[PDB]
Write a structure and sequence with these properties.
Chain B: Keywords: Calcium, Metal-binding. Chain B: This is Possible Tripartite transporter component (TRAP-T family), substrate binding protein. The PDB classes it as transport protein. The structure is a homodimer. By secondary structure, chain A is α/β, with parallel strands linked by helices. Chain A has two domains: about 210 residues, no CATH class; about 110 residues, no CATH class. Chain A is about 50% helix and about 15% strand. In chain A, helix 5 links the parallel strand 6 and strand 7. In chain A, helix 1 runs antiparallel to helix 10. In chain A, about 55% of the residues are buried. At the A-B interface, helix 1, helix 3, helix 10, helix 12 and helix 13 of A face helix 1, helix 3, helix 10, helix 12 and helix 13 of B. The complex binds 2-oxopentanoic acid (2 copies) and calcium ion (2 copies). One 2-oxopentanoic acid binds next to loops of chain B. One calcium ion binds next to loops of chain B.
Chain lengths: ~325, ~325
């Protein structure tokens, strides 16, 4: 007889986003199915029991046993957490999964989460993000000066160096903030989530690419001690379920964003590519931010150099095995 | 008490093909771990209990309960099985997973396997394959006329329409055949597997891309009646373990191929892009082959048109959300 385990999972997400909230639900449903009801986890939307941006805090305190969040929400505690979500001009979703599972990423991220009493598992990806929504159209790089924009992580810091006034909001809050006039622009994920949250209603000017988040990972987090007290069978169920959340969510976003792109263009939204004045300035600002973080911390520097090497090698591989068919019509 | 289930899994793979055999091992180990030993599956290498090309036949007959194979080994039984692995100029591994899980592909493939008493689950990908190994560099499309090349499946049929003299050889045999002068060229999967077979020693010209296999799926198969007999808990364990095999294998190949590519370029291998004359002729010959299959069968035609639509839409999406960052090299 294995125990009846009953857990709660705090998430960073609103229930309306069945893509990303769906990853948390998948983990909870699958351990219940595999355990025949002996191992249950109740998922909660952002703000129900824990604020969306404080999932790691609640997991560390053990006010919940586990969570579903984005590591880059905690760059204030350790800028190295950025690599476990996405960094500007960083890894594709497929490269990010390769880096986590076989390039040393999951070991690097678990070493950081160990400092906050937690263990981490990849448990979602949005795939490549788009460039966000603007109430007024962008004319050139100088159009960004003084804009109030919702955008998190090191992407936010890059946009701040370009003169954007970066605002902190969980996904659920963006539409009201855009309507009330609190902000002038926002990015979230892509067509499917952006349209569902009402971003295409609040703003008409959509850009690409989302160079800040080329393949952002969502992590399942478990309290170290809660994880220790789990029998080996239930650890295996949870760990395996997170692979389904990770591959299942990426595939779900690819499908839903592909349909939503067609829907919003038919409904009147025009998608524009960012000018090279913005892309060049973003790349340069990103290099400056990573240089500063590296000079301030040998651990960050060492991780940045291992990740940069992984990135160079995997891009060289994908330039041969994938890019030629992607660009040939 | 849930039952003590003991199954056997027939695989299409030698144990030396370890990244792919590893997918089968992952499923077997993970259901044993999650069930605390109550659900065990014993994996077998190709030939040990069932020939590698007869996994589906063995699963249908229930001589084994489950299998790990490539749907495109069964195109002689139904050419529609091709889409469940890879087709020339088809889907990237990421697009292939999107198509299977959400685009209707798993439902299409399960309707085909239902004819043979089987249910199917995605359970691996090699990722994009390369264009194979050539002793002498290719000058142009006419250089392929009469060239003796190891290349199997629909890829071989396309290369045949380009005038290639298609040679059938096992993985293990290609090195000797290249050295002996028996064949002029050969493809397998990519740098990791190809280096282990000695192909970097036998030839200096490695072509790309492998337009015949842009993201080949490996499928777990279960006998429909064996699956029916399985408690709901063990079904969930098996189905979930196949997601780990699928994402795990692709990521493992990406890592191994990226490392092996660096080793073989240091060993003086030249990476050559196929000329547009070959890529245009191959795309056209592939479209002719799929046209003939479609004209001979309304069910094939319908599936080809659903897949072509999914492919157009996903490519349109990836041209926006991925290609811009992928094509700028620093
Ligand atoms: C990582 C998914 C959520 C996100 O991209 C964001 O909060 O912007
Ligand atoms: C998917 C493995 C089979 C193959 O690609 C080959 O033998 O060439
Ligand atoms: Ca975002
Ligand atoms: Ca091959």
């Amino acid at each position: 007889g294995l125990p009846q385990v009953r857990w709660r999972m705090a998430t960073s997400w609103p229930i309306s986003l069945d893509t990303i909230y769906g990853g948390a639900v998948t983990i909870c449903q699958r351990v219940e199915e595999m355990s025949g009801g002996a191992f249950r986890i109740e998922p909660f939307a952002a703000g129900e029991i824990v604020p969306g941006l404080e999932v790691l805090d609640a997991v560390q305190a053990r006010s919940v046993e586990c969570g579903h969040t984005a590591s880059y929400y905690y760059i204030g505690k350790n800028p190295a957490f950025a690599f476990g979500t996405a960094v500007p001009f960083g890894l594709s979703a497929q490269q990010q999964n390769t880096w986590l599972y076989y390039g040393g990423g999951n070991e690097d991220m678990n070493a950081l989460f160990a400092d906050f009493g937690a263990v981490s598992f990849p448990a979602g990806n949005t795939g490549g993000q788009l460039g966000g929504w603007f109430k007024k159209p962008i004319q050139n790089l100088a159009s960004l000066q003084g804009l109030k924009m919702r955008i998190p992580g090191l992407g936010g810091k890059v946009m701040a160096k370009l003169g954007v006034n970066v605002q902190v909001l969980p996904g659920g809050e963006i539409y009201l903030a855009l309507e009330r006039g609190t902000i002038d622009a926002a990015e979230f994920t892509g067509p499917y989530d952006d349209e569902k949250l009402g971003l295409a209603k609040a703003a008409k000017h959509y850009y690409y690419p989302g160079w800040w988040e080329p393949g952002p990972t969502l992590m399942a987090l478990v309290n170290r001690k809660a994880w220790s007290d789990l029998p080996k069978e239930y650890q295996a169920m949870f760990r395996t379920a997170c692979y389904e959340a990770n591959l299942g969510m990426l595939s779900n976003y690819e499908w839903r964003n592909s349909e939503a792109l067609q829907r919003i263009t038919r409904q009147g939204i025009k998608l524009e590519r960012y000018g090279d004045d913005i892309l060049k300035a973003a790349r340069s600002a990103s290099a400056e931010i990573f240089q500063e973080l590296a000079d301030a911390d040998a651990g960050f520097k060492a991780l940045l150099e291992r990740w940069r090497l992984f990135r160079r090698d995997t891009r060289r591989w994908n330039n041969i095995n994938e890019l030629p068919l992607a660009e040939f019509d």
